[PDB]
Amino acid sequence: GIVEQCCTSICSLYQLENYCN
Amino acid sequence: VNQHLCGSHLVEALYLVCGERGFFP
């Protein structure tokens, strides 16, 4: 999920954007 | 610099990137 992808590991702008509305 | 985004810092980044919020996933 987002916390695994962005908190545990490092995520990019494009990855973050996948979770927007 | 710290590139990790956790907790309130992740929320803030999502508000920045998405504008009108995103979906808690």
Side-chain angles (χ1 to χ4, degrees), chain A residues 1-4 6-21, chain B residues 1-19 21-23 25:
Chain A
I2 196 171
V3 0
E4 214 273 84
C6 288
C7 171
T8 304
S9 288
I10 299 170
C11 67
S12 71
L13 173 72
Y14 307 110
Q15 281 176 274
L16 268 182
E17 281 172 342
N18 289 337
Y19 294 96
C20 295
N21 285 341
Chain B
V1 307
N2 184 20
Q3 282 164 265
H4 292 84
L5 284 176
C6 300
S8 68
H9 289 292
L10 181 50
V11 176
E12 297 157 13
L14 284 163
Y15 280 27
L16 179 70
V17 156
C18 307
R21 305 212 36 179
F23 66 80

mmCIF file of all heavy atoms in Angstrom, unseen atoms left out:
data_model
loop_
_atom_site.group_PDB
_atom_site.id
_atom_site.type_symbol
_atom_site.label_atom_id
_atom_site.label_comp_id
_atom_site.label_asym_id
_atom_site.label_seq_id
_atom_site.Cartn_x
_atom_site.Cartn_y
_atom_site.Cartn_z
ATOM 1 N N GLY A 1 0.845 -1.212 0.000
ATOM 2 C CA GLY A 1 0.000 0.000 0.000
ATOM 3 C C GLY A 1 0.871 1.250 0.000
ATOM 4 O O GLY A 1 2.090 1.149 -0.179
ATOM 5 N N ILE A 2 0.238 2.417 0.222
ATOM 6 C CA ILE A 2 0.972 3.672 0.117
ATOM 7 C C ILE A 2 2.047 3.762 1.199
ATOM 8 O O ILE A 2 3.122 4.293 0.950
ATOM 9 C CB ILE A 2 0.030 4.903 0.100
ATOM 10 C CG1 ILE A 2 0.753 6.167 -0.403
ATOM 11 C CG2 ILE A 2 -0.647 5.066 1.453
ATOM 12 C CD1 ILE A 2 -0.153 7.371 -0.651
ATOM 13 N N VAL A 3 1.771 3.263 2.407
ATOM 14 C CA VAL A 3 2.777 3.439 3.448
ATOM 15 C C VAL A 3 4.016 2.553 3.204
ATOM 16 O O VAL A 3 5.139 3.020 3.252
ATOM 17 C CB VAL A 3 2.250 3.557 4.901
ATOM 18 C CG1 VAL A 3 0.738 3.470 5.072
ATOM 19 C CG2 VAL A 3 3.038 2.777 5.940
ATOM 20 N N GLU A 4 3.804 1.329 2.756
ATOM 21 C CA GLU A 4 4.899 0.480 2.303
ATOM 22 C C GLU A 4 5.692 1.170 1.183
ATOM 23 O O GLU A 4 6.916 1.183 1.223
ATOM 24 C CB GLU A 4 4.289 -0.844 1.837
ATOM 25 C CG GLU A 4 5.156 -2.059 2.106
ATOM 26 C CD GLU A 4 6.182 -2.399 1.039
ATOM 27 O OE1 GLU A 4 7.292 -1.804 1.070
ATOM 28 O OE2 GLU A 4 5.882 -3.297 0.206
ATOM 29 N N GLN A 5 5.002 1.752 0.180
ATOM 30 C CA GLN A 5 5.662 2.298 -1.003
ATOM 31 C C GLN A 5 6.382 3.620 -0.714
ATOM 32 O O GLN A 5 7.433 3.886 -1.300
ATOM 33 C CB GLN A 5 4.646 2.497 -2.129
ATOM 34 C CG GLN A 5 4.061 1.205 -2.674
ATOM 35 N N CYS A 6 5.807 4.468 0.158
ATOM 36 C CA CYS A 6 6.251 5.852 0.276
ATOM 37 C C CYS A 6 6.894 6.148 1.637
ATOM 38 O O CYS A 6 7.699 7.059 1.750
ATOM 39 C CB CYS A 6 5.060 6.792 0.070
ATOM 40 S SG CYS A 6 4.490 6.859 -1.647
ATOM 41 N N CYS A 7 6.546 5.380 2.678
ATOM 42 C CA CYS A 7 7.123 5.583 4.002
ATOM 43 C C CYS A 7 8.272 4.594 4.261
ATOM 44 O O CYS A 7 9.361 5.016 4.635
ATOM 45 C CB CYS A 7 6.026 5.450 5.046
ATOM 46 S SG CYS A 7 6.601 5.432 6.761
ATOM 47 N N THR A 8 8.030 3.283 4.110
ATOM 48 C CA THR A 8 9.079 2.267 4.274
ATOM 49 C C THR A 8 10.172 2.442 3.219
ATOM 50 O O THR A 8 11.348 2.621 3.548
ATOM 51 C CB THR A 8 8.502 0.847 4.301
ATOM 52 O OG1 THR A 8 7.543 0.824 5.349
ATOM 53 C CG2 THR A 8 9.550 -0.219 4.553
ATOM 54 N N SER A 9 9.767 2.365 1.940
ATOM 55 C CA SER A 9 10.627 2.661 0.795
ATOM 56 C C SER A 9 10.432 4.126 0.388
ATOM 57 O O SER A 9 9.650 4.841 1.018
ATOM 58 C CB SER A 9 10.315 1.710 -0.348
ATOM 59 O OG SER A 9 10.779 0.392 -0.070
ATOM 60 N N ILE A 10 11.101 4.553 -0.691
ATOM 61 C CA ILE A 10 10.977 5.896 -1.247
ATOM 62 C C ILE A 10 10.121 5.867 -2.523
ATOM 63 O O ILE A 10 10.415 5.106 -3.454
ATOM 64 C CB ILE A 10 12.365 6.503 -1.537
ATOM 65 C CG1 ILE A 10 13.232 6.639 -0.286
ATOM 66 C CG2 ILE A 10 12.224 7.835 -2.252
ATOM 67 C CD1 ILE A 10 14.659 7.012 -0.585
ATOM 68 N N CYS A 11 9.094 6.737 -2.594
ATOM 69 C CA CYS A 11 8.284 6.835 -3.813
ATOM 70 C C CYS A 11 8.512 8.143 -4.590
ATOM 71 O O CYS A 11 8.982 9.137 -4.044
ATOM 72 C CB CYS A 11 6.801 6.630 -3.514
ATOM 73 S SG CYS A 11 6.044 7.938 -2.500
ATOM 74 N N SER A 12 8.189 8.129 -5.893
ATOM 75 C CA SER A 12 8.350 9.263 -6.797
ATOM 76 C C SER A 12 7.020 9.995 -6.929
ATOM 77 O O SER A 12 6.009 9.455 -6.490
ATOM 78 C CB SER A 12 8.711 8.763 -8.143
ATOM 79 O OG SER A 12 7.575 8.125 -8.702
ATOM 80 N N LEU A 13 7.033 11.176 -7.574
ATOM 81 C CA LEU A 13 5.837 11.996 -7.794
ATOM 82 C C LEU A 13 4.778 11.164 -8.512
ATOM 83 O O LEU A 13 3.627 11.187 -8.108
ATOM 84 C CB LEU A 13 6.172 13.267 -8.600
ATOM 85 C CG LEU A 13 4.980 14.132 -9.037
ATOM 86 C CD1 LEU A 13 4.371 14.860 -7.859
ATOM 87 C CD2 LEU A 13 5.366 15.147 -10.117
ATOM 88 N N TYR A 14 5.183 10.391 -9.531
ATOM 89 C CA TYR A 14 4.242 9.638 -10.349
ATOM 90 C C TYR A 14 3.534 8.578 -9.519
ATOM 91 O O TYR A 14 2.314 8.460 -9.605
ATOM 92 C CB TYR A 14 4.899 9.237 -11.674
ATOM 93 C CG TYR A 14 5.459 10.482 -12.320
ATOM 94 C CD1 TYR A 14 6.828 10.698 -12.410
ATOM 95 C CD2 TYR A 14 4.607 11.518 -12.690
ATOM 96 C CE1 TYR A 14 7.331 11.881 -12.932
ATOM 97 C CE2 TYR A 14 5.092 12.706 -13.207
ATOM 98 C CZ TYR A 14 6.460 12.886 -13.328
ATOM 99 O OH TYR A 14 6.937 14.069 -13.845
ATOM 100 N N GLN A 15 4.277 7.915 -8.628
ATOM 101 C CA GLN A 15 3.682 6.940 -7.716
ATOM 102 C C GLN A 15 2.655 7.590 -6.791
ATOM 103 O O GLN A 15 1.579 7.027 -6.540
ATOM 104 C CB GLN A 15 4.735 6.229 -6.864
ATOM 105 C CG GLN A 15 5.469 5.124 -7.594
ATOM 106 C CD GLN A 15 6.534 4.609 -6.660
ATOM 107 O OE1 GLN A 15 7.627 5.160 -6.607
ATOM 108 N NE2 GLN A 15 6.218 3.578 -5.890
ATOM 109 N N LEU A 16 3.025 8.735 -6.202
ATOM 110 C CA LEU A 16 2.111 9.411 -5.301
ATOM 111 C C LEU A 16 0.805 9.696 -6.017
ATOM 112 O O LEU A 16 -0.250 9.492 -5.437
ATOM 113 C CB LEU A 16 2.707 10.722 -4.810
ATOM 114 C CG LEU A 16 3.477 10.624 -3.514
ATOM 115 C CD1 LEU A 16 3.974 12.005 -3.121
ATOM 116 C CD2 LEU A 16 2.617 9.978 -2.422
ATOM 117 N N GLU A 17 0.914 10.138 -7.275
ATOM 118 C CA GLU A 17 -0.222 10.611 -8.062
ATOM 119 C C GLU A 17 -1.250 9.502 -8.298
ATOM 120 O O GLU A 17 -2.444 9.775 -8.413
ATOM 121 C CB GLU A 17 0.278 11.251 -9.353
ATOM 122 C CG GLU A 17 0.780 12.655 -9.096
ATOM 123 C CD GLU A 17 1.462 13.314 -10.275
ATOM 124 O OE1 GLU A 17 1.861 12.575 -11.208
ATOM 125 O OE2 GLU A 17 1.648 14.550 -10.214
ATOM 126 N N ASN A 18 -0.784 8.250 -8.317
ATOM 127 C CA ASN A 18 -1.647 7.087 -8.481
ATOM 128 C C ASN A 18 -2.702 6.976 -7.363
ATOM 129 O O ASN A 18 -3.648 6.181 -7.483
ATOM 130 C CB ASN A 18 -0.828 5.785 -8.482
ATOM 131 C CG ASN A 18 0.027 5.569 -9.712
ATOM 132 O OD1 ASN A 18 -0.247 6.127 -10.768
ATOM 133 N ND2 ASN A 18 1.050 4.736 -9.593
ATOM 134 N N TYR A 19 -2.521 7.702 -6.248
ATOM 135 C CA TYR A 19 -3.423 7.581 -5.106
ATOM 136 C C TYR A 19 -4.305 8.813 -4.983
ATOM 137 O O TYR A 19 -5.009 8.939 -3.996
ATOM 138 C CB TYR A 19 -2.649 7.401 -3.795
ATOM 139 C CG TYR A 19 -1.889 6.103 -3.731
ATOM 140 C CD1 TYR A 19 -0.548 6.036 -4.067
ATOM 141 C CD2 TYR A 19 -2.532 4.909 -3.437
ATOM 142 C CE1 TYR A 19 0.138 4.830 -4.066
ATOM 143 C CE2 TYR A 19 -1.858 3.695 -3.420
ATOM 144 C CZ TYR A 19 -0.514 3.655 -3.724
ATOM 145 O OH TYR A 19 0.143 2.443 -3.701
ATOM 146 N N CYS A 20 -4.251 9.716 -5.953
ATOM 147 C CA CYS A 20 -5.116 10.894 -5.918
ATOM 148 C C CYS A 20 -6.560 10.540 -6.300
ATOM 149 O O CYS A 20 -6.819 9.438 -6.788
ATOM 150 C CB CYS A 20 -4.643 11.979 -6.880
ATOM 151 S SG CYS A 20 -3.031 12.711 -6.491
ATOM 152 N N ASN A 21 -7.476 11.507 -6.083
ATOM 153 C CA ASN A 21 -8.877 11.481 -6.488
ATOM 154 C C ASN A 21 -9.070 12.211 -7.822
ATOM 155 O O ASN A 21 -8.152 12.952 -8.205
ATOM 156 C CB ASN A 21 -9.793 12.176 -5.472
ATOM 157 C CG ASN A 21 -10.021 11.344 -4.229
ATOM 158 O OD1 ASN A 21 -9.808 10.132 -4.237
ATOM 159 N ND2 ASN A 21 -10.461 11.991 -3.162
ATOM 160 N N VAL B 1 19.075 14.411 2.019
ATOM 161 C CA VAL B 1 17.796 14.698 2.736
ATOM 162 C C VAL B 1 16.925 13.443 2.774
ATOM 163 O O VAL B 1 17.065 12.540 1.945
ATOM 164 C CB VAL B 1 17.016 15.884 2.129
ATOM 165 C CG1 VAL B 1 17.888 17.125 2.022
ATOM 166 C CG2 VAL B 1 16.346 15.546 0.795
ATOM 167 N N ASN B 2 16.011 13.439 3.745
ATOM 168 C CA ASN B 2 15.048 12.367 3.962
ATOM 169 C C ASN B 2 14.001 12.362 2.847
ATOM 170 O O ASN B 2 13.273 13.332 2.672
ATOM 171 C CB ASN B 2 14.410 12.505 5.348
ATOM 172 C CG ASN B 2 13.457 11.380 5.694
ATOM 173 O OD1 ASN B 2 13.498 10.300 5.103
ATOM 174 N ND2 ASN B 2 12.600 11.628 6.666
ATOM 175 N N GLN B 3 13.939 11.263 2.085
ATOM 176 C CA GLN B 3 12.973 11.162 1.007
ATOM 177 C C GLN B 3 11.772 10.311 1.407
ATOM 178 O O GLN B 3 10.910 10.097 0.555
ATOM 179 C CB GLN B 3 13.617 10.653 -0.286
ATOM 180 C CG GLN B 3 14.417 11.714 -1.032
ATOM 181 C CD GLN B 3 15.322 11.065 -2.048
ATOM 182 O OE1 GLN B 3 16.495 10.807 -1.788
ATOM 183 N NE2 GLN B 3 14.759 10.726 -3.196
ATOM 184 N N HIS B 4 11.722 9.833 2.671
ATOM 185 C CA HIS B 4 10.621 9.003 3.137
ATOM 186 C C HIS B 4 9.441 9.893 3.521
ATOM 187 O O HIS B 4 9.660 10.960 4.069
ATOM 188 C CB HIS B 4 11.023 8.115 4.327
ATOM 189 C CG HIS B 4 11.999 7.053 3.925
ATOM 190 N ND1 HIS B 4 13.348 7.304 3.860
ATOM 191 C CD2 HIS B 4 11.857 5.783 3.558
ATOM 192 C CE1 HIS B 4 13.991 6.223 3.449
ATOM 193 N NE2 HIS B 4 13.101 5.291 3.251
ATOM 194 N N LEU B 5 8.212 9.397 3.299
ATOM 195 C CA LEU B 5 6.995 10.144 3.584
ATOM 196 C C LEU B 5 6.089 9.284 4.457
ATOM 197 O O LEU B 5 5.525 8.309 3.969
ATOM 198 C CB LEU B 5 6.312 10.433 2.245
ATOM 199 C CG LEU B 5 6.940 11.558 1.406
ATOM 200 C CD1 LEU B 5 6.225 11.679 0.065
ATOM 201 C CD2 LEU B 5 6.891 12.900 2.161
ATOM 202 N N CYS B 6 5.960 9.657 5.740
ATOM 203 C CA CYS B 6 5.251 8.870 6.732
ATOM 204 C C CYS B 6 4.262 9.782 7.457
ATOM 205 O O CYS B 6 4.561 10.943 7.703
ATOM 206 C CB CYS B 6 6.232 8.333 7.771
ATOM 207 S SG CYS B 6 7.524 7.267 7.061
ATOM 208 N N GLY B 7 3.098 9.227 7.791
ATOM 209 C CA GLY B 7 2.158 9.852 8.713
ATOM 210 C C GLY B 7 1.699 11.194 8.174
ATOM 211 O O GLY B 7 1.357 11.262 7.004
ATOM 212 N N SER B 8 1.734 12.241 9.013
ATOM 213 C CA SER B 8 1.244 13.567 8.644
ATOM 214 C C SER B 8 2.032 14.144 7.460
ATOM 215 O O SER B 8 1.476 14.905 6.675
ATOM 216 C CB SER B 8 1.244 14.505 9.828
ATOM 217 O OG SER B 8 2.574 14.788 10.234
ATOM 218 N N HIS B 9 3.295 13.713 7.298
ATOM 219 C CA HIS B 9 4.163 14.143 6.210
ATOM 220 C C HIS B 9 3.680 13.573 4.875
ATOM 221 O O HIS B 9 3.740 14.241 3.843
ATOM 222 C CB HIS B 9 5.633 13.822 6.526
ATOM 223 C CG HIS B 9 6.151 14.722 7.602
ATOM 224 N ND1 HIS B 9 6.336 16.077 7.411
ATOM 225 C CD2 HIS B 9 6.451 14.483 8.891
ATOM 226 C CE1 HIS B 9 6.744 16.629 8.547
ATOM 227 N NE2 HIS B 9 6.814 15.681 9.459
ATOM 228 N N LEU B 10 3.192 12.327 4.891
ATOM 229 C CA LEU B 10 2.593 11.732 3.693
ATOM 230 C C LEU B 10 1.268 12.407 3.348
ATOM 231 O O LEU B 10 0.987 12.709 2.193
ATOM 232 C CB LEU B 10 2.415 10.240 3.984
ATOM 233 C CG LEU B 10 1.826 9.398 2.861
ATOM 234 C CD1 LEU B 10 2.551 9.630 1.524
ATOM 235 C CD2 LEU B 10 1.887 7.927 3.275
ATOM 236 N N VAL B 11 0.445 12.664 4.366
ATOM 237 C CA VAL B 11 -0.805 13.379 4.123
ATOM 238 C C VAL B 11 -0.527 14.723 3.458
ATOM 239 O O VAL B 11 -1.192 15.071 2.470
ATOM 240 C CB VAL B 11 -1.659 13.491 5.401
ATOM 241 C CG1 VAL B 11 -2.929 14.323 5.200
ATOM 242 C CG2 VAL B 11 -2.009 12.085 5.866
ATOM 243 N N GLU B 12 0.446 15.478 4.000
ATOM 244 C CA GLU B 12 0.785 16.809 3.493
ATOM 245 C C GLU B 12 1.250 16.693 2.039
ATOM 246 O O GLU B 12 0.878 17.507 1.193
ATOM 247 C CB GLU B 12 1.892 17.474 4.334
ATOM 248 C CG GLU B 12 1.546 17.764 5.799
ATOM 249 C CD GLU B 12 2.688 17.907 6.814
ATOM 250 O OE1 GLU B 12 3.860 18.025 6.403
ATOM 251 O OE2 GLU B 12 2.411 17.869 8.046
ATOM 252 N N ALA B 13 2.093 15.683 1.750
ATOM 253 C CA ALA B 13 2.568 15.495 0.381
ATOM 254 C C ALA B 13 1.414 15.185 -0.574
ATOM 255 O O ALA B 13 1.348 15.749 -1.665
ATOM 256 C CB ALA B 13 3.637 14.434 0.334
ATOM 257 N N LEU B 14 0.466 14.335 -0.161
ATOM 258 C CA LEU B 14 -0.720 14.036 -0.970
ATOM 259 C C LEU B 14 -1.610 15.276 -1.187
ATOM 260 O O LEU B 14 -2.079 15.506 -2.298
ATOM 261 C CB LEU B 14 -1.476 12.886 -0.283
ATOM 262 C CG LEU B 14 -0.804 11.522 -0.488
ATOM 263 C CD1 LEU B 14 -1.313 10.491 0.529
ATOM 264 C CD2 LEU B 14 -1.035 11.036 -1.916
ATOM 265 N N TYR B 15 -1.815 16.094 -0.151
ATOM 266 C CA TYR B 15 -2.560 17.334 -0.330
ATOM 267 C C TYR B 15 -1.854 18.247 -1.333
ATOM 268 O O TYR B 15 -2.530 18.888 -2.127
ATOM 269 C CB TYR B 15 -2.686 18.144 0.965
ATOM 270 C CG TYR B 15 -3.747 17.683 1.922
ATOM 271 C CD1 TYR B 15 -4.152 16.357 1.926
ATOM 272 C CD2 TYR B 15 -4.366 18.562 2.803
ATOM 273 C CE1 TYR B 15 -5.120 15.896 2.801
ATOM 274 C CE2 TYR B 15 -5.346 18.118 3.683
ATOM 275 C CZ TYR B 15 -5.716 16.778 3.687
ATOM 276 O OH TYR B 15 -6.709 16.306 4.520
ATOM 277 N N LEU B 16 -0.510 18.332 -1.261
ATOM 278 C CA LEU B 16 0.278 19.140 -2.186
ATOM 279 C C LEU B 16 0.119 18.663 -3.638
ATOM 280 O O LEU B 16 -0.196 19.459 -4.531
ATOM 281 C CB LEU B 16 1.746 19.103 -1.751
ATOM 282 C CG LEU B 16 2.726 19.885 -2.634
ATOM 283 C CD1 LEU B 16 2.521 21.400 -2.484
ATOM 284 C CD2 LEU B 16 4.169 19.474 -2.335
ATOM 285 N N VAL B 17 0.330 17.356 -3.843
ATOM 286 C CA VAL B 17 0.379 16.722 -5.149
ATOM 287 C C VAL B 17 -1.013 16.578 -5.783
ATOM 288 O O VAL B 17 -1.145 16.710 -7.000
ATOM 289 C CB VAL B 17 1.133 15.378 -5.052
ATOM 290 C CG1 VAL B 17 0.744 14.419 -6.162
ATOM 291 C CG2 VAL B 17 2.633 15.614 -5.019
ATOM 292 N N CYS B 18 -2.046 16.301 -4.974
ATOM 293 C CA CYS B 18 -3.387 15.980 -5.477
ATOM 294 C C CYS B 18 -4.309 17.209 -5.468
ATOM 295 O O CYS B 18 -5.322 17.239 -6.162
ATOM 296 C CB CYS B 18 -4.070 14.840 -4.708
ATOM 297 S SG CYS B 18 -3.071 13.326 -4.576
ATOM 298 N N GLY B 19 -3.956 18.255 -4.733
ATOM 299 C CA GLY B 19 -4.924 19.326 -4.519
ATOM 300 C C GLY B 19 -6.092 18.769 -3.704
ATOM 301 O O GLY B 19 -5.846 18.099 -2.704
ATOM 302 N N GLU B 20 -7.339 18.979 -4.163
ATOM 303 C CA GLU B 20 -8.529 18.319 -3.617
ATOM 304 C C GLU B 20 -8.308 16.824 -3.317
ATOM 305 O O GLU B 20 -8.858 15.956 -3.989
ATOM 306 C CB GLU B 20 -9.740 18.540 -4.529
ATOM 307 N N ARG B 21 -7.423 16.571 -2.343
ATOM 308 C CA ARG B 21 -7.256 15.301 -1.645
ATOM 309 C C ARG B 21 -7.204 14.072 -2.565
ATOM 310 O O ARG B 21 -7.408 14.125 -3.785
ATOM 311 C CB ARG B 21 -8.279 15.196 -0.507
ATOM 312 C CG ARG B 21 -8.225 16.367 0.464
ATOM 313 C CD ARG B 21 -8.595 15.914 1.865
ATOM 314 N NE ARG B 21 -8.080 14.572 2.116
ATOM 315 C CZ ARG B 21 -8.217 13.887 3.249
ATOM 316 N NH1 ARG B 21 -8.699 14.475 4.329
ATOM 317 N NH2 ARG B 21 -7.823 12.625 3.309
ATOM 318 N N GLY B 22 -6.920 12.933 -1.930
ATOM 319 C CA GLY B 22 -6.805 11.632 -2.551
ATOM 320 C C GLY B 22 -7.519 10.590 -1.699
ATOM 321 O O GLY B 22 -8.228 10.938 -0.770
ATOM 322 N N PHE B 23 -7.316 9.312 -2.027
ATOM 323 C CA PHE B 23 -8.119 8.264 -1.418
ATOM 324 C C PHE B 23 -7.196 7.431 -0.546
ATOM 325 O O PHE B 23 -6.103 7.102 -0.993
ATOM 326 C CB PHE B 23 -8.905 7.484 -2.485
ATOM 327 C CG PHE B 23 -8.100 6.660 -3.470
ATOM 328 C CD1 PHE B 23 -7.605 5.401 -3.129
ATOM 329 C CD2 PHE B 23 -7.849 7.126 -4.754
ATOM 330 C CE1 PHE B 23 -6.870 4.644 -4.033
ATOM 331 C CE2 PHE B 23 -7.124 6.361 -5.661
ATOM 332 C CZ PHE B 23 -6.631 5.130 -5.300
ATOM 333 N N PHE B 24 -7.631 7.137 0.682
ATOM 334 C CA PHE B 24 -6.751 6.547 1.680
ATOM 335 C C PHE B 24 -6.518 5.074 1.334
ATOM 336 O O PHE B 24 -7.411 4.250 1.492
ATOM 337 C CB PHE B 24 -7.275 6.845 3.087
ATOM 338 N N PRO B 25 -5.330 4.713 0.798
ATOM 339 C CA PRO B 25 -5.096 3.434 0.135
ATOM 340 C C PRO B 25 -3.887 2.651 0.689
ATOM 341 O O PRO B 25 -3.118 2.043 -0.085
ATOM 342 C CB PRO B 25 -4.694 4.121 -1.167
ATOM 343 C CG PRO B 25 -3.770 5.259 -0.739
ATOM 344 C CD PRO B 25 -4.149 5.572 0.691
#
